[PDB]
Amino acid sequence: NRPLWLPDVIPPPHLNGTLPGDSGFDPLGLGLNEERLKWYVEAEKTNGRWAMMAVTGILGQELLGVPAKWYEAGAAEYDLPVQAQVPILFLVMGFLETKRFQGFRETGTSGFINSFPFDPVGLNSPKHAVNEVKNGRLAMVAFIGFAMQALVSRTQPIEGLQKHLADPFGKNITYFLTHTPEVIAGT
Amino acid sequence: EEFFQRATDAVSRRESLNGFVALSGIAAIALFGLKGASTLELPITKG
Amino acid sequence: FVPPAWAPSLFVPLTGLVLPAIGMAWAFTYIQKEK
């Protein structure tokens, strides 16, 4: 009925399966409080949305051909300096986060501004929720992979994909972990 | 008999007197040093 | 960052004179308070 870890059956009693994308993945038994588990569900959904925006921003910035690398753009030069960016970044996004937390405490779902549903077009299918949760887990895995491309290979994500496609045997984890000084010294 | 009666009228209450003495002590302590000292040749800011 | 040159000329007087005075006043009100 559920994907679980693998086709082998590992049914947990705490997670029946009513949650969107509930495969019962609780090996360490993290969710048992029955009050902060809903908070963890909201945390997973919000982290998945943020991971969605992160991976789509990285993919779009590499596809459109920005000059700076994806994790090297923090020290890049802009019309607005970094000192003129942190104030509004804290202020307006803190206002948004406070309103979202108040809406979550009032109703139990997310929300941008004031209104809980934030559905101008609707499409609030349970299948849509399951797809959102699974696509968010995939985006989380993708962002971890992107950070690992930046760490080990020190290259762009789609650049690493092209390197793996061109030379599958010679541009893998074994080569990139057995040739760290070459990677440090400009690949 | 008019004097020394309304002089303490705005300071008779406990909150007003406590606020006045705290404000005056803090102001005198902050004035000490950068303004209280270095004018009466106090041997701590000379070197 | 680096504090100004008058910072030792200012901060030591509070914590030496008016911070113990405020703390002692608050504690003296705390001891003798009745219900």
Added chain:
Amino acid sequence: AAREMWYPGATPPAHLDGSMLGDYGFDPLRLGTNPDRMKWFREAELTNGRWAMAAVVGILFTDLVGLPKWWEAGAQTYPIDNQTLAIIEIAVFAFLEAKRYEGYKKTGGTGFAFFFPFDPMGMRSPEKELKELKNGRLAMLAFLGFASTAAVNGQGPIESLQTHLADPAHNNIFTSSVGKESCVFVAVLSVLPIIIEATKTLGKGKESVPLFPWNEEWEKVA
């Protein structure tokens, strides 16, 4: 303490019932847990704001007509000696503030001279004094900004506006010598509503009032 608060979604304090006008519930330390103390503080805020309106409009007029810088204007040679000017200022204020305090004790208004309140035309309404409190608070925040921009930038209000309009991206409060301190301060100010909401949600019961030596709110704690 009114539906409109200092940050959206805030809860009013227990002692701030919204009876007093101009309330926005911005009482993090609760220094006004007394009716007499808050009416005296309201009068004090009104004074430090009314003189702020006067100072702001005077400084704006001096900058408009070409008069020199305000914080350096005290060293110029003026008619009447400064010592006797100070003693006649003290002499006139020892009557003005005395009459103000006696009138506040007998009426409570911010009257002047012998007419308490000094309202000859009769424009008195709660909305007028609400706007007076708002404009006074804005004017005294503007005076703090004037003093800040006259210390690290060395320019007046009009010159500060001209420098903001010349290049707003790199000429602001976050790019000066206090720029990093301003960034840390505004990050703290943005992080306050994320702390206080967390404690309010966590503190479903009890009191959770802040304990400070000035107020007697810790009396009910123990």
Added chain:
Amino acid sequence: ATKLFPKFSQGLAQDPSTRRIWYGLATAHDFESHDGMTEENLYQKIFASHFGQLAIIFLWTSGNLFHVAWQGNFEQWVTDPIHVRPIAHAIWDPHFGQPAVEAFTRGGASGPVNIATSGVYQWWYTIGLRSNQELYVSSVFLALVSAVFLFAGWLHLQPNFQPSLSWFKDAESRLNHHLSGLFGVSSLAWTGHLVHVAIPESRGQHVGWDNFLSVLPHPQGLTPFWSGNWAAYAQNPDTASHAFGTADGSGTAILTFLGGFHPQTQSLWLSDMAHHHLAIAVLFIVAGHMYRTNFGIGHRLEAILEAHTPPAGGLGAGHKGLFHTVNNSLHFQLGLALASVGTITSLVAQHMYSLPPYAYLAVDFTTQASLYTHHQYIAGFIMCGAFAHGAIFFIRDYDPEQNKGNVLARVLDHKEAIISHLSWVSLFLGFHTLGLYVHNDVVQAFGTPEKQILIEPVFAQWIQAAQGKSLYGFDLLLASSSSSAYSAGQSLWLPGWLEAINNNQNSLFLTIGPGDFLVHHAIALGLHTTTLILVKGALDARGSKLMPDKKDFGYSFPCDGPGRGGTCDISAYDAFYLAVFWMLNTIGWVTFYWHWKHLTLWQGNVSQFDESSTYLMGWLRDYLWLNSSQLINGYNPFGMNSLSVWAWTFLFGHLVYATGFMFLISWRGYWQELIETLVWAHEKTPLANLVYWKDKPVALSIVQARLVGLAHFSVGYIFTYAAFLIASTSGRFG
């Protein structure tokens, strides 16, 4: 009555006396005696207090960082780690005078500063900190850490977030996590920081956060770690002629076992420390999967305690029933923790001076002396606390029906034998040590010093010969090439360890004579006697022949009155308060020995200590009197040198010692009658009887008398010895 200050004690609230304040302060954190409270609330208060104590620790070290970065000479000390003294913090005293300001301007400062003896300069130079901005950002980071620890203390005490009572009682999971995470991966992160930053900074390469993730720690680059060729890391170590600040004589080695010390700075190698912490990390992580967590594997502590019962009734019931005894009693765990931490602190003191881990620390004599003295005094105080809290465990939470016939019931059964044998060994040690010291003093007084009894410490000398010291002769291990211990690892650490141990300049296994043996035996006397007092208090805590019902009277009660001959100082608290005196004497002895031996080593006159530590007049004259000349000359009618503050705090310590005597000799009744007469005087006078006291003045309690006398005694002891130590080590050395 019913005042609000003792909110944790209704009985103390209805106390119309000044004692209500005192007992309102001393019983502040004794939550077990607070009225109307449960075990879960006590555990939550313990958690919040632990978070606060941690936040205070982080605030104190952040303040040390800030006060070194601001008004300090850390960069100047980095450039010259020998000549210019470190600066602790600036002095702004308006009571100072012009000669005081001029005399305290040291280290190239713009004002009066304090010369740092804490050793943070050497430590931060060793770990890689070089600039003041790094110390600034470290201070603000640790302030933020203290802020989030305050957040944790507030949040974990809040409702719906307070941990359950059984959550703290999860001993297996706590042990596993604090072995794997608190110890293992923390040491792994520390050795990673060492390898990434400190070794390149010791090799003249700046590794900061800006240039992080772009500088390779090793030229091979992590492929030896995967391939298992870990010897590539120990390939090119730093040479003997290597400068710590620069890259001259450098090498490429992140992990090695180059024993001994760095020749340029007389300190342990950075790669050696990194390898040590890495090995400690992997060993702790491996050991941290022992205990039974929620998974199907592990060890149960109760089952191990049940199983380890010796057959044939050697230990009776064995270690059975001890799991609930440890878990239920917080004082048992408190005593075990304080004892282990005191032993570790004593180990730190005994190993830091002989093996300096920080660069340019051995040359700083005052710093090493202050660090050793501080660590030994802290260790002694918390061993006394360990035994005191063990007595508290024996009085408060000990059920003989639970652990019946086990090791605890057996040591309670033959407690008289243990106390008697400890008294015997203490009497033997003290009698003969004083007999030998008095014999040597009388012999030296008669002008013929060769009659004195000098027993050569052949045991410890043979031990040191077995570890590499060839000056004593012998043919033991690590001294003859034919020994298997020498042949094993002869190219691993012996070429450095023997070089470090055969040099007499450093403090690594110093030459010991008969005076060293005599003072070590005196130290053994001090340890045995303090142990005898503490275990007499702990074993007789819940009962005795004079007081069978001592458990019903609590841990801290004054006496039982003059009946049955007299019963003063019968509680275990009073035994602890006497053992504090004995511990102070013992640590005074060990610090006197360390200070005199190291002072004679630094001056080069080791023969003076060899021929002068034999008799106590040499201790009084050549150590207490000879080295106090510069201390007492800090201020005088002639003038003032830089040691005026040390003379002032020396007299301060003597005065607080005297006030401890004031509170210790007289007990209560004279002060109660004097306060009664003062009450009559205040009540029966005009112009002053209008103002009246809200709380009746009373004499301090006998338990409070002992506490205040002990506090003044210990404060005076610590301040006096710190003054003398720092003044003598800094007036003639730099």
Added chain:
Amino acid sequence: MIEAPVAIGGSTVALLGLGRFVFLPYQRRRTDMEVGPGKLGPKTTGDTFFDRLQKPASFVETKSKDPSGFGIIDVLGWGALGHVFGYFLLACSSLQDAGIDAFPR
């Protein structure tokens, strides 16, 4: 030197074989008097969130699809032991080929 893959794989395969075919009969009999039902067994009732967090999850003991009782927790433990032994052998060989003799001559 010894190549890392052959040594690591042989060590972990041997350790897993010892875990499944050798030490498994000695397993579940050392835990019989350790976490058995006759003794105290479980340590927590599982009332609130922390108490049921102390309670074992439903993942380590649900079933044993292996013919023996070799669960994946034992697989992880024995594989960790095998990796430890293989890295120990590789480390000893690495010290050996570097020209350093740690053994007593």
